[PDB]
């Protein structure tokens, strides 16, 4: 199907310890494969997947130089935004950056994104045309202008449509045995009597990859979105994900509710009913 490589950077300022803390991670689809921690003695881009260790030491040197550069530019961005929003040096703040590229089943360029956020709110994004920018507040207008001056759009597009997708393909075909897979969910259903005149039907769907999954409840065919407890897809630790969806059911009406599951690994969706 469709694959994606996304890079995440997080830098948090701590007045009193000077140098902010900077953590960066790399993901291919829903699998982390690289990392860098500022306060780590390593001071190098470390691997987090087994299919990336194949790369030689030159690759790691280049990636380390790059990520350290990105750390510096973040250390500048913190102060710059402190000036823009006119905030005091006595306050902690967080700068977040995310950018990557996607490819379709033909392994060609479909989408590419790049976006900055300051303290959890969107700061400046790249629209899906890769030529213009989305600016949130007056402070981001200045950045938008600065970038429109140095033709950052064309450069970033040249990267996303070139190196990004290429080495995404390389990563896919290197770690093929894990990244190129579709583990169907292992669904089951539990039924707990919350009371004498009620019940809870919990629909478990666990051990599946990728994380993209749909899990809904229906009563007589219509969705129970208003009365459905739904946790967020959570990791298991071995590269698979878990998710369950529960509903409150009047006692004696279990046969009316059905749990619907959709995932890339299931040829056709699944429909479950208790007993």
């Amino acid at each position: 199907g469709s694959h994606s490589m996304r890079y995440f950077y997080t830098s948090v300022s701590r007045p009193g310890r000077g140098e902010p803390r900077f953590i960066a991670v790399g993901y291919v689809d829903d699998t982390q494969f690289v990392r860098f921690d500022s306060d780590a003695a390593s001071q190098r881009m470390e691997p987090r997947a087994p299919w990336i260790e194949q790369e030689g030491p030159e690759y790691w040197d280049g990636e380390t130089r790059k990520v350290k550069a990105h750390s510096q530019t973040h250390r500048v961005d913190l102060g710059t935004l402190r000036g823009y929003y006119n905030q005091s040096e006595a306050g902690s703040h967080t700068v977040q950056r995310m950018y990557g590229c996607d490819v379709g089943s033909d392994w060609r360029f479909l989408r590419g994104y790049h976006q900055y956020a300051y303290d959890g709110k969107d700061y400046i994004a790249l629209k899906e045309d890769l030529r213009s920018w989305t600016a949130a507040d007056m402070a981001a207008q200045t950045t938008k202008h600065k970038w429109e001056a140095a033709h950052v759009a064309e450069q970033l597009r040249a990267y996303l449509e070139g190196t990004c997708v290429e080495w995404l393909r390389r990563y896919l075909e290197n770690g093929k045995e894990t990244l190129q897979r579709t583990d169907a969910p292992k669904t089951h259903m539990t039924h707990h009597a919350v009371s004498d005149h009620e019940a809870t039907l919990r629909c478990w769907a666990l051990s599946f990859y990728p994380a993209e999954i749909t899990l809904t409840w229906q009563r007589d065919g219509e969705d129970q979105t208003q009365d459905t407890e739904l946790v967020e897809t959570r990791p298991a630790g071995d590269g698979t994900f878990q998710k369950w969806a529960a509903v409150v059911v009047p006692s004696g009406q279990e046969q009316r509710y059905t749990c619907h599951v959709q995932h890339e690994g299931l040829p056709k969706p699944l429909t479950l009913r208790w007993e």
């Binding site: 690759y59 710059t80 970033l156």
Partner: peptide, 9 residues
Amino acid sequence: KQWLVWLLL
């Protein structure tokens, strides 16, 4: 592989 350009705000 990640981007080679420095991008300041």
